Amino acid sequence: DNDEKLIIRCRVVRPAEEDHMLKKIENTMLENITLRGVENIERVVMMK
């Protein structure tokens, strides 16, 4: 967390064609991994 650039390194482990599998995987990555907070709640503001 102390670096000036934040990168995540990831590779698929395997027991050809890997471009579109990686595309689908990162798409799923981007879409579905919750980080924190309850779903169906969007940007929340606080008033005084």
Binding site: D1, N2, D3, E4, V45, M46, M47, K48
Partner: protein, 164 residues
């Protein structure tokens, strides 16, 4: 003990890699082992948070920015405190720290939202509080044969009323 000796090997490597190559090799490996015991004073190979704190301190030593932390740990920075710091956001380095507080301040500003503020006048009195801090609006609601609505909004207590 494998994790013990591995952390020791990493610590001896990073302090031998310092710009101040310490001729006090036994003293600096004593620093390394005392940092090892005060580090395992958290969990001692019982929880992965030990490894996480290891990653934090190891990469902070490596980073460059900053390099001066190597000399500062070689010549001070008593490590039993640095088990219990968790305090990576306040070290290595100060310019990044200042960047962090200004980022946090801007985030806190952007969190709190709309604050429309209801421009007033002083002519009418409140329907309930009866004081003159009255704010209004104009628009016409019903059909064309009549004028606007003359909406009212008190601000001494928040009352609403209307005038024809």
């Amino acid at each position: 003990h494998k994790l013990r000796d591995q952390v020791l090997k990493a610590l001896y490597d990073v302090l031998a890699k310092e710009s101040e190559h310490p001729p006090q090799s036994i003293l600096h490996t004593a620093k390394a082992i005392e940092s090892e015991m005060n580090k395992v004073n958290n969990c001692d190979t019982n929880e992965a948070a030990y490894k996480a704190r290891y990653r934090i301190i190891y990469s902070n030593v490596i980073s460059k920015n900053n390099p001066d932390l190597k000399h500062k740990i070689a010549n001070g920075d008593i490590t039993p405190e640095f088990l219990a710091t968790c305090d990576a956001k306040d070290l290595a380095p100060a310019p990044l720290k200042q960047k962090i507080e200004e980022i946090a301040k801007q985030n806190l500003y952007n969190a709190q939202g709309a604050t429309i503020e209801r421009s007033v006048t002083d002519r009418f009195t409140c329907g309930k509080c009866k004081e003159k801090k009255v704010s209004y609006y104009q628009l016409q609601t019903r059909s064309a044969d009549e004028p606007l609505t003359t909406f009212c909004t008190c601000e001494a207590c928040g009352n609403r009323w209307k005038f024809s």
